Amino acid sequence: MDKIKQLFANNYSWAQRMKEENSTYHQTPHYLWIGCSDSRVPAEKLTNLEPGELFVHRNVANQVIHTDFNCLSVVQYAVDVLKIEHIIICGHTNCGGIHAAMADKDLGLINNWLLHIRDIWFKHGHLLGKLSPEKRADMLTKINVAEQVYNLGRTSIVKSAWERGQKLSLHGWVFDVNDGFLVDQGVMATSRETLEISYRNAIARLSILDEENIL
Amino acid sequence: MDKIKQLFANNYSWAQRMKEENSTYHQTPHYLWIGCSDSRVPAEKLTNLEPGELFVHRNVANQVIHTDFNCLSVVQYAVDVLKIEHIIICGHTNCGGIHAAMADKDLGLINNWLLHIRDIWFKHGHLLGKLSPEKRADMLTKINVAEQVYNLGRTSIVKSAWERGQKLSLHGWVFDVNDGFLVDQGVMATSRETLEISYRNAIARLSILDEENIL
Amino acid sequence: MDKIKQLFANNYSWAQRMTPHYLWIGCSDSRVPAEKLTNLEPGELFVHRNVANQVIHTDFNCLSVVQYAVDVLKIEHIIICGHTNCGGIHAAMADKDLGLINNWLLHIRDIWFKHGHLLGKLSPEKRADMLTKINVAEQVYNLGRTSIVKSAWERGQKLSLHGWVFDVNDGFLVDQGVMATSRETLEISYRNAIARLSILDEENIL
Amino acid sequence: MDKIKQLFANNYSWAQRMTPHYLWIGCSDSRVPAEKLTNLEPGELFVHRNVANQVIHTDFNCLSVVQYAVDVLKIEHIIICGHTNCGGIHAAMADKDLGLINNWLLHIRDIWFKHGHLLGKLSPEKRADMLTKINVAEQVYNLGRTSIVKSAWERGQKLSLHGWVFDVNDGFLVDQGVMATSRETLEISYRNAIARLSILDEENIL
Ligand SMILES: [Zn+2]
Ligand SMILES: [Zn+2]
Ligand SMILES: [Zn+2]
Ligand SMILES: [Zn+2]
């Protein structure tokens, strides 16, 4: 009603409201943030950092697919050129991508993209399959974050930065709108060997279920 | 010093400061936003919209590469499934990607990604080549936004949504940190034929240079 | 160089001395062309070859070929063909960091992990060949799970998926037993194939 | 079906009746294998075939093959080979919406636009062939602009890029004249090739 006009109007009064308050208008990035296209609170706000200090990639279900030229080159640029020492993979609750990933309907091109979430499901299927169906999505969102960190750590870019003695740590969090909190999923890597132990330990922890959701 | 701890600390007091102020913690998206990984003001703030109403993809130099599975499937999901009626490609000033695109140094994997900005440069090389070198980056950022809108409009996904009578409009803006304003680059498509005219008209307008920067 | 000028001579002399019905997804290592080992007439084969004959879910290149094959060319048979002594499969199994190609091969390594119990009670020298077969059945399964092939079946189109390995050692193709003409047949034969591969003969056991 | 059971028979009878030095980036339409038209010994060719023999800047599949070829296999020659009657090039030139494959072919269409003045003073029936040649020179140029090939040259590695078209009509390969052994030679021969193609003979003129 028209929605583009409202956006332009909101943009204008925003900028004018900022300039009224100070002189709000260089800064080098310190984290690479890999997040989900359908999350709704932004990283810069959620993490309450200075603007400019997050380098941000957002795709559906916040994935690091082994062969995705988009994300890979972003990671390569962050690490090799911008020399960012932290990559963070942030999932979130009530994630549309994960939901689209689990529902059977073919949605078209995007299903192909989401097939990597489905392999992950079937990888931890024994775990997810003894979980009551209505809770699966919440666990898959967590395990997804664990697997993408592991994926990131296995990329040739990251392994090589570790091999040549460059400082680089990988993190995997889930943002929960329900309390505003970032929650650690336990996979934290500064090396190939921290990657393996941390990931394995993380899946082991996730695999212990609340009695009220089992068979 | 440690930077991860500060982030967690900032996250906590943020969430606690929001809950103090109200009960800040469903909403369907209305725009697909395609933006740049190194821009620093977020879309949700910049456009001052309700959270949840932007579906956001961010990659380096805000590109829609014909064959990028990541962005394409995002666009396909937005249009075919979420039924978003507006895709916005937002570039910005002092864009690192464009700068990396123009500097000669091989930066590695990312140069391959940026080669599409370089083809664009050489496509409008006659224009950019009669511009004083120190201004080129600013024009290339604008022309880039024009070309990516055109790319979006030529994807099979968009053409098909137009063919079956679905409402879909494409926009191409540049965010200017220097005044907070979103500036229209002139390419605005609701159909294949609006795409062509609008794009052509846009390049023609961009090609008229300020006398003080020519030969 | 000489090599190149030799190439042209060889072609020039070869010239003087002288629609498709299948999509063939074979491997870039393989040494015997599909057209030769199948003895098919020139033009029957519409061919894609990549490293380790892969159908990666999100690879635009291969997915494009499949879509073009099925929706436009109206091909009714897609054959995925692995082979023995596959340098890709061997590369994927080494610890060595090879750069960009490693990221491509990580998909194979995920396969290795997926059937790691099976491969773990196998003899070291025989693992590459098992993984080569497992790989074939998995790419067929991957093909059958594309939106493209699923829409084709859904809409009633006659389409059949095949997974074969070509053994250099003797020139014979061997069907790996995952063969789909629908989504339900895909499930059944994929699972059957893995179950068949899981039953091990004494002189493959560690 | 019968077709398939026929395929195996043909292979079984063909069997009874019976490191690589080049990377070959050819097209999935082409009907004559590289190994045949070059008369090379089996295993000399390490092969990638996609639609319209493309080296798209950001295609992981093809870029992976090149990296593996150059950095690991240590191949010193990459040949890009277009051909006449290329169904991909024809597909790219039609107005018809073919689905996913169109997005793949948009890279060719960008090429068509790029040399649109040249193609615009050409006769309609002869355009596909001009675009096929232009396409070859452009993919070679694309290959020479990858970080992979540029690092290889930079670091002193012996690597040569080639761009040929194979004409079905008579079996002869014809060099398109863009041949690079370095970044500076790439520029010079690419530009030379386009300039050569731009000089038009009377019976190609509209
Ligand atoms: Zn999400
Ligand atoms: Zn930027
Ligand atoms: Zn092989
Ligand atoms: Zn062809």
Interface test with C, best of D21, D35, D53, D72 (most C CBs within 10 A): D72
**In terms of residues, how long is chain C?**
206
Contact C111, D85 (CB under 8 A): no
Q: Look up the CATH number of domain D1-206.
A: 3.40.1050.10
Residue D48's φ and ψ, nearest 5 degrees, are: -125, 130
- The pair of structure tokens assigned to D137 is 């020179």
Contact B172, B187 (CB under 8 A): yes
Calculate the CA dihedral of residues A150, A152, A153, A155 and round it to 10 degrees. Answer: 120
D27 assigned ligand-binding residue? yes
Q: Quick one: three-class SS letters along chain A? A: CCHHHHHHHHHHHHHHHHHHHCCCCCCCCCEEEEEECCCCCCHHHHCCCCCCCEEEEEECCCCCCCCCHHHHHHHHHHHHHCCCCEEEEEEECCCHHHHHHHCCCCCCHHHHHHHHHHHHHHHCHHHHHCCCHHHHHHHHHHHHHHHHHHHHHHCHHHHHHHHCCCCCEEEEEEEECCCCEEEECCCCECCHHHHHHHHHHHHHHHCCCCHHHCC
B92 assigned ligand-binding residue? yes
Under the phi-then-psi rule, with left for phi > 0, alpha for psi from -120 to 50, and beta for the rest, what region is B62? left
Pick B37's closest partner by Cβ from A7, A51, A57. A57
Ligand showing the shortest atom-to-Cα distance for residue D90: 4
Residue B136 a catalytic site member: no
Contact C104, C51 (CB under 8 A): yes
Q: Tell me the three state secondary structure of residue C126.
A: helix
Which positions in chain C touch A68 (Cβ < 8 Å)?
Answer: 58
Residue in B57, B95, B116, B171 annotated catalytic: B95
Under the phi-then-psi rule, with left for phi > 0, alpha for psi from -120 to 50, and beta for the rest, what region is B180? left
**In terms of residues, how long is chain B?**
215
CB hemisphere CA count around B109 (13 angstroms): 29
Chain D CA closest to residue C25: D49
Residue type, A3: K
Ligand showing the shortest atom-to-Cα distance for residue A99: 1
Interface test with D, best of C3, C5, C7, C22 (most D CBs within 10 A): C7
Ligand showing the shortest atom-to-Cα distance for residue C90: 3
Residue A62's φ and ψ, nearest 5 degrees, are: 45, 70
C117 assigned ligand-binding residue? no
Whether D64 sits inside 8 A of C103 (CB atoms) is: yes
Q: C77-83 and C22-27 as β-strands: parallel, antiparallel, unpaired? A: parallel
Ligand showing the shortest atom-to-Cα distance for residue A61: 1
Chain C CA closest to residue A125: C114
Contact D58, B121 (CB under 8 A): no
Whether B68 sits inside 8 A of C60 (CB atoms) is: yes
Residue B90 a catalytic site member: no
Q: How far is the CA of A37 from the centre of ligand 1 (A)?
A: 6
Which positions in chain C touch A155 (Cβ < 8 Å)?
Answer: 103, 106
Residue type, A64: V
Question: Please, what's the b/e burial string for A119-142 (b: 16 or more CB within 10 A of its CB; e: otherwise)?
Answer: bbbebbeebbeebeeeebbebbbb
- Could you write out the DSSP letters of every residue in C37-102? HTTPPTTSEEEEEETTS---TT-HHHHHHHHIIIIIS---EEEEEEESS-HHHHHHHS----SHHH
Query: What is the C-alpha R_g of chain A?
Result: 19
Q: Look up the CATH number of domain A1-215.
A: 3.40.1050.10
Instruction: Give the DSSP H/E element, type plus range, for residue D129.
Output: helix D127-144
- The pair of structure tokens assigned to A65 is 């697919």
Residue D27 a catalytic site member: yes
Which positions in chain B touch C60 (Cβ < 8 Å)?
Answer: 67-69, 72
- The pair of structure tokens assigned to A74 is 């972003």
Contact D55, D80 (CB under 8 A): yes
- The pair of structure tokens assigned to C98 is 């090879």
Whether A73 sits inside 8 A of B110 (CB atoms) is: yes
Measured distance CA(D158)–CA(D70) in Å, rounded: 10
| Ion ligand 2 — residues with CB < 5 Å | B 36, 38, 95, 97
How many other β-carbons are positioned within 10 Å of the β-carbon of residue B13? 11
List the beta bridge partners of residue A203: none
Whether A72 sits inside 8 A of C103 (CB atoms) is: yes
Nearest-neighbour CA in chain D from C132: distance (Å): 18
Q: B181-184 and C22-27 as β-strands: parallel, antiparallel, unpaired? A: unpaired
Positive or negative, the Cα torsion across D84, D89, D93, D95?
Answer: positive
Classify burial at A198, counting beta carbons within 10 Å of its beta carbon; exposed 0-12, middle 13-18, buried 19 or more: buried
Q: How far is the CA of B62 from the centre of ligand 1 (A)?
A: 20
- The pair of structure tokens assigned to B194 is 């609006």
List the beta bridge partners of residue C147: none
Q: Tell me the three state secondary structure of residue D41.
A: coil
Whether D11 sits inside 8 A of C104 (CB atoms) is: no
Contact A14, B46 (CB under 8 A): yes
Measured distance CA(A182)–CA(A173) in Å, rounded: 6
Measured distance CA(A161)–CA(A166) in Å, rounded: 5
Whether A116 sits inside 8 A of C151 (CB atoms) is: no
Measured distance CA(D74)–CA(A25) in Å, rounded: 52
C27 assigned ligand-binding residue? yes
Chain A CA closest to residue C55: A112
Residue corresponding to tokens 């123009």: B102
| Ion ligand 1 — residues with CB < 5 Å | A 36, 38, 95, 97
Residue D155 a catalytic site member: no
Contact D144, B115 (CB under 8 A): no
Pick B59's closest partner by Cβ from A10, A24, A70. A70
List the beta bridge partners of residue A183: A174
List the beta bridge partners of residue B33: B56, B88
Residue C62 a catalytic site member: no
Contact C198, C118 (CB under 8 A): yes
Residue B159's φ and ψ, nearest 5 degrees, are: -60, -40
Which positions in chain B touch D110 (Cβ < 8 Å)?
Answer: 66, 119
Residue D149's φ and ψ, nearest 5 degrees, are: -70, -35
